[PDB]
Amino acid sequence: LKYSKSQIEKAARKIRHGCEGAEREEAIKMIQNFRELHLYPLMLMKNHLDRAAKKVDKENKIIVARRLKRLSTIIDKLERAIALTRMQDIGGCRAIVRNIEQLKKLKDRLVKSRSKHKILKEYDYLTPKPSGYSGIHLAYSCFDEENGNNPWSKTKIEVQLRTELQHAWATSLEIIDTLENIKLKTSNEGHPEWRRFFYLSGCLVAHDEGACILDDETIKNYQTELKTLEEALSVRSKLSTYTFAMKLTSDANLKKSLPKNHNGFFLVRMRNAIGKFLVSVKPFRKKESEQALQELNKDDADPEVLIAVLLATNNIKSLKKAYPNYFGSTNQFGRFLSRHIDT
Amino acid sequence: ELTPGIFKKGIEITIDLEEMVCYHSGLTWKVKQLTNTLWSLAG
Ligand SMILES: Nc1ncnc2c1ncn2[C@@H]1O[C@H](COP(=O)(O)OP(=O)(O)OP(=O)(O)O)[C@@H](O)[C@H]1O
Ligand SMILES: [Mg+2]
Ligand code: NA
């Protein structure tokens, strides 16, 4: 219940070197305590950010999201060299703005704020990162200098600023990365085509947004590569099909048909009728995964089937929770891809 | 522990279950739920 910052740094060193047993259970308990200390400052920064976003946009169209980083994610990060007490994002906030002008207007307001929470670092990623990621991160230290008997002194909270198109790119990257099982963050090796697809589309997003303007020769060669990579990967089709399958599993009638503890697969199939089409979503228990794969290969071999996809329900659930407006984003990203490919 | 997704076939498609409309193959399809797990798309 009462662990000092020295005990927490020492608990994090234990997980890095690979502890086990009772030693591991004490280390994880101290780290969970440290994780819980970020809850109040996370929610405080979220209201601070919502109050500042309502000032820059009187229409109230800025979407604000927040998340406390999961214990399992923190534990995995330490055993893969980031220091636990140097981590900037145990608590993280995000503001999604309409355009770059709105983005810079919100950044200026947060930077000019006179509060006890200090921006220790401003990360300008308006020129995309090697992944294709673009936006702005603000690394806050809550109750930085004015402390006393405050348990929340120097609590690190991350603030992400993004436009709708930068967010549509990031949502599409998370959907593909999760559902295709390509570990893009996990490793810097493998899937060079998918890596290059997301980098070039990212560069073209920051160009269209006005975040980082590329010259005309670069636009032309990037569009040629984008058309090539997209055909090889079938990005627009995979992105549409995944979104369509996710949309159907949210149906109310479908959810009562489900077994109460469903934790297996969903088989989404579309076929021609004897112009008319039949769409079905078939639930499968986790134990029936071999039966689900067999039924998927039968639909893949059928010429009357246009859509055939197998999706784990737990992955669908977490993507819907992380991205409430996932369908608006995948639609926008697919339209953006068509504008650059069909030039 | 299981594979999050296995993609075999797909097309560019959008569906809105509030409006009960679907868009694919350059056409507009009216959606109707036949059973809890089954739908039909008609011209
Ligand atoms: N600042 C933030 N505000 C809101 N949501 C965030 C923020 N940072 C991450 N998320 C989202 O929370 C979800 C969980 O992500 P997770 O914590 O596992 O990894 P990550 O923070 O994105 O990256 P990393 O582990 O490389 O530092 C993702 O959908 C991610 O986009
Ligand atoms: Mg992070
Ligand atoms: Na979203």
User: What residue spans define the domains of chain A?
Assistant: 5-163, 236-341
- Option in A181, A237, A250 nearest B11 (CB): A237
Q: Order of strands, edge to edge, in the sheet holding B13-16?
A: B5-9, A305-312, A265-272, A276-284, B38-42, B27-35, B21-24, B13-16
Residues B37, A283: contact at Cβ < 8 Å? yes
Q: b/e map of A164-173 (b: 16 or more CB within 10 Å)?
A: bbbbbbbbbb
The number of angstroms, rounded, from the C-alpha of A40 to the middle of its chain's C-alpha atoms is 23
Per the structure block, which two tokens stand in for A3?
């662990």
Residues A30, A71: contact at Cβ < 8 Å? no
Choose which residue among A67, A162, A187 to substitute to test ligand 1 binding: the one with the highest number of ligand atoms within 8 A of its C-beta: A67
> Nearest 5°: CA angle at B8, between A312 and A308?
70
Q: CA of B27 to nearest chain A CA: how many angstroms apart?
A: 10
Q: Which fold has domain A5-163?
A: Beta Polymerase; domain 2 (3.30.460)
Look up tokens 């970020």; give the residue: A38
Ligand 1 atom at minimum distance from A322 CA: 29
Q: Is A161 helix (H, G, I), strand (E, B) or coil?
A: strand
- Taken as a whole, chain B contains a residue count of 43
List helix spans (H) across chain A: 5-16, 21-36, 39-56, 71-78, 100-112, 164-179, 192-208, 216-233, 235-249, 252-257, 289-301, 313-322, 326-341
CA A27 to centroid of ligand 3, rounded, Å:
34
Phi, psi of A317 (to 5 degrees): -55, -50
Resolution of this model in Å is 2.3
- Neighbouring residues of A278: CB distance < 8 A, sequence distance ≥ 6: A270, A271, B38, B39, B40, B41
Rounded Cα–Cα distance for residues B25 and A292 (Å): 27
